[PDB]
């Protein structure tokens, strides 16, 4: 997609600094609009970041921190909106880039030399921050009050100039010292200090060089169509103040007709539907969680809806990071009770060391592995799953065997939907898992963990931008040294662990949750019928024949005959005498025929027929 998520990493070090560079090479690959923050952190001088060239707009802020790159490939960035801000104050932050005076000689030790943000035309909220970048030139010769939006001049700025090197002047082809950088490509744009009076925007000094009111990042022609980025919405190349309404009204009655020319609101845009993992809402918002008194429903096209509870809504179970558990860092002895029998979770799940070695001063108990059984009902998670400790008695993640999907609408550090770190364990066992709705999956420092290369990660994602990220685990050469793999019946060798209960799809048949070579149609005593590759008993009257069987479906009339007696149509080991009525007629003393038919008696009581022609009905 041309739209991607931003991140939330704000001067935390990477959970794997080694595989951090390639995480960004997936997440931002050819992205044009960032739904979040653009963070560039701890990136070394060798970093081929050229895939960032396509970013046109950021809805959050930009943070470029602690990097040893000489330059940043961001020359296409038109504008930043500041829907979030760094320290609630800043929309562009440049921190601590180069080296902090280590014991290291290298003549180009990184640090950003220049601005080179050659497109940046507007900032709609928040200030600018630059600190401890001793390599940086030209940040001081900028008219930042052209770029700060005229109608929201929250123009705080804190810029460092403590250089440890010289700066020569920018190319004299510029109209004075107004530059991004050193070359004749690198002149600063002006769009507000070359304009006057009613011209809130222009491309030049004339009244014809002015731009339309909806146009933030400048214009080419004078019309609302002619514009390089727009202040409120883009709809189909029209710069609209609002998205078009989804309803038409009577104007007096306010009786309502749906409008097919309506759109939903999503980021900087108006769209006719919400993208795959989001929620559609009655008022036309595309969201992550439903509004209060709206439920997330299983809408027909899979594109979920938030529609209205005409009774009080069902008490769905919150995960960590939502309502009841927003601030709550961990599953513990106290909140594990709140998941008992829950099948969809509204939030995330997290296992830290402190989840299991629970603190007696913050008076919680250490966690028993048996308390984890409360999750075995779980079908779906709206947030993420994070694991950084596990009990040494569990070689696997068995309590999640029934989990189909993790959405990642909430993400760990804004980026990750599944984390499995430092756990030691040998396999995963997640047999039902078939979807990762958004965000990356991280699996690192796991001592014995085999078979992670056998999972068809292809089938779980819904964009070309997500990957599995792995390092410091078990060698897969030492997994063939263990002599084990996925089982013979695992389709293309795809599994979650060792044996017939672990395959992602089965080559032959399913006996309950066992993938098997064949089923007991002929080959044994407990006979099993086939139901579209599943295998099941009847009620036990498919009596073993030498080449056939006796009741196919568990409505016991269906393979060929009966084993001992018939009560038409069904089959039994004895004609029965029930002592509960509903209506005042029990099965009256059903005598066997010679072909075993269980026939009722010909007089109501008193006179004859008790199977032995005796006395066993009352009166």
């Amino acid at each position, epitope marked *: 997609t041309q739209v991607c998520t931003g991140t939330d990493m704000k001067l935390r070090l990477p959970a794997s600094p080694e595989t951090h560079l390639d995480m960004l090479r997936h997440l931002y690959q050819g992205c044009q609009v960032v739904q979040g923050n653009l963070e560039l952190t701890y990136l070394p001088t060798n970093a081929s970041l050229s895939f960032l060239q396509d970013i046109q707009e950021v809805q959050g802020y930009v943070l470029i921190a602690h990097n040893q790159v000489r330059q940043v490939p961001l020359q296409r960035l038109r504008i930043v909106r500041g829907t979030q801000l760094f320290e609630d104050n800043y929309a562009l932050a440049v921190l601590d880039n180069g080296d902090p005076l280590n014991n290291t000689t290298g003549a180009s030790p990184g640090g950003l030399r220049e601005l080179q943000l050659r497109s940046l035309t507007e900032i709609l*909220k928040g200030g600018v921050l630059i600190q401890r970048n001793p390599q940086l030139c030209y940040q001081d010769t900028i008219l930042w009050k052209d770029i700060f939006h005229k109608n929201n001049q929250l123009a705080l700025t804190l810029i460092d100039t403590n250089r440890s090197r010289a700066c020569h002047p920018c190319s004299p082809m510029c109209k004075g010292s107004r530059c991004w950088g050193e070359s004749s490509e690198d002149c600063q744009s002006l769009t507000r200090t070359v304009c006057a009076g009613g011209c809130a925007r222009c491309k030049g000094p004339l009244p014809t060089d002015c731009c339309h009111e909806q146009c933030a990042a400048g214009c080419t022609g004078p019309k609302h169509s002619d514009c390089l980025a727009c202040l409120h919405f883009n709809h189909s190349g029209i710069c609209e103040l*609002h998205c078009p*309404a989804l309803v038409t009204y009577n104007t007096d009655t*306010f009786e309502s007709m749906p409008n097919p020319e309506g759109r939903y*609101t999503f980021g900087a845009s108006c769209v006719t539907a919400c993208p795959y993992n989001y929620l559609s809402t009655d*008022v*036309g918002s595309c969201t992550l969680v439903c*509004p*209060l008194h709206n439920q997330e429903v299983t809408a027909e096209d899979g594109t979920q809806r938030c529609e*209205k509870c005409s009774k009080p809504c069902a008490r769905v179970c919150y995960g960590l990071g939502m309502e009841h558990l927003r601030e709550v860092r961990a599953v513990t002895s106290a909140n594990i009770q709140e998941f008992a029998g829950c099948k969809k979770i509204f939030g995330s799940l997290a296992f830290l060391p402190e989840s299991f070695d629970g603190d007696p001063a913050s008076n919680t108990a250490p966690l028993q592995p048996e308390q984890l059984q409360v999750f075995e009902t779980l079908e779906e998670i709206t947030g993420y799953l994070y694991i950084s400790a596990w009990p040494d008695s569990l070689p696997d993640l068995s309590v999640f065997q029934n989990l189909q999907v993790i959405r990642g609408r909430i993400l760990h550090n804004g980026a990750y939907s599944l984390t499995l770190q430092g756990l030691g364990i040998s396999w995963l066992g997640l047999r039902s898992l078939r979807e990762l709705g958004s965000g990356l999956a991280l699996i690192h420092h796991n001592t014995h963990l085999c078979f992670v290369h056998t999972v068809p990660w292809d089938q779980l994602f819904r964009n070309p931008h997500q990957a599995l990220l792995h390092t410091a685990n078990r060698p897969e050469d030492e997994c063939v040294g263990e002599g084990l793999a996925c089982h013979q019946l695992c389709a293309r060798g795809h599994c979650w662990g060792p044996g017939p209960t672990q395959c992602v799809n089965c080559s032959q048949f399913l006996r309950g949750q066992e993938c098997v070579e064949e089923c007991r149609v002929l080959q044994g005593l407990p006979r099993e019928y086939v139901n579209a590759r599943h295998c099941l008993p009847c009620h036990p009257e498919c009596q073993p024949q030498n080449g056939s069987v006796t009741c196919f479906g568990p409505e016991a009339d269906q393979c060929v005959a009966c084993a001992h007696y018939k009560d038409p149509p069904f089959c039994v080991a004895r004609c029965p005498s029930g002592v509960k009525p509903d209506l005042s007629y029990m099965p009256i003393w059903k005598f066997p025929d010679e072909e075993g038919a269980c026939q009722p008696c010909p007089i109501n009581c008193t006179h004859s027929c008790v199977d032995l022609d005796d006395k066993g009905c009352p009166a």
Partner: antibody, heavy 119, light 108 residues
Framework: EVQLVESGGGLVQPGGSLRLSCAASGFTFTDYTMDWVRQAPGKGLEWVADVNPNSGGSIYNQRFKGRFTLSVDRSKNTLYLQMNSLRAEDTAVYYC????????????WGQGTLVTVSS | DIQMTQSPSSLSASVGDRVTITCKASQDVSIGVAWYQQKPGKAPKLLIYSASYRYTGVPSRFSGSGSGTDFTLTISSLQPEDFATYYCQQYYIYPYTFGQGTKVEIKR
């Protein structure tokens, strides 16, 4: 507890105009329709208008057809209401609210502010 | 408009009392009525919706009933904080409407 805060109340001479403000606290302004409701001294309540936070598209009471103007400031969790040219018929304490009628019935509210007229 | 009157306009109750208030429409509002309190010099808040469902964060004591044109509030035991004005509201027919108000007065 979760609640709204109103401003811009005051008094004018007959045929004069004024405007009110409402700011939301403890919840997201972005996800619910927002409302004005008033108490005209010595009664219960009269509904004035609804307004949406996503585009400022709004529905006033017919008592204000072509008279009153609603607007939203989704940049700062806030909204505004413009008044028209009363000779005290529209004298009230005006309160802000937000919606829960799948239709119009209101669950969260503000302290309100005064509008009164005399010569 | 449907006129959603309250009654009776003043009624004296003490802390601990079971208390009742009624509400009446000019037209059918069958599942289309909600209930309110407003304290002296305070914001209002919602109590009950569709005559009978208590709302989020509303105290332990509140309940409601009725349908068609005729509706009820009940407080199962009264608090020191209930000496207040009360309303009901309709949500079927534009423009939307409450009533004239009613006080639960302090009994002594």
């Amino acid at each position: 507890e979760v609640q709204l805060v109103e401003s811009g109340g005051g008094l004018v001479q007959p045929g004069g105009s004024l405007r009110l403000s409402c700011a939301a606290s403890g919840f997201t302004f972005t996800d619910y329709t927002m409302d004005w409701v008033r108490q005209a001294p010595g009664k219960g309540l009269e509904w004035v208008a609804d307004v949406n936070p996503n585009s400022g598209g709004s529905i006033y009471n017919q008592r204000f057809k072509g008279r009153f103007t609603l607007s939203v400031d989704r940049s700062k969790n806030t909204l505004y209401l413009q008044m028209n040219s009363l000779r005290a018929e529209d004298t009230a304490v005006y309160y802000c609210a937000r919606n829960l009628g799948p239709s119009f019935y209101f669950d969260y509210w503000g302290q309100g502010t005064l509008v009164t007229v005399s010569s | 408009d449907i006129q959603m009157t309250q009654s009776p306009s003043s009624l004296s109750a003490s802390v601990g009392d079971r208390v009742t208030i009624t509400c009446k429409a000019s037209q059918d509002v069958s599942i289309g009525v909600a209930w309110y309190q407003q304290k002296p010099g305070k914001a209002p808040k919602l109590l009950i919706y569709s005559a009978s469902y208590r709302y989020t964060g509303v105290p332990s004591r509140f309940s409601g009933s009725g349908s068609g044109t005729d509706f009820t509030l009940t407080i199962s035991s009264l608090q020191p904080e209930d000496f207040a004005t009360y309303y009901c509201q309709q949500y079927y027919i534009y423009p939307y409407t409450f009533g004239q108000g009613t006080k639960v007065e302090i009994k002594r």
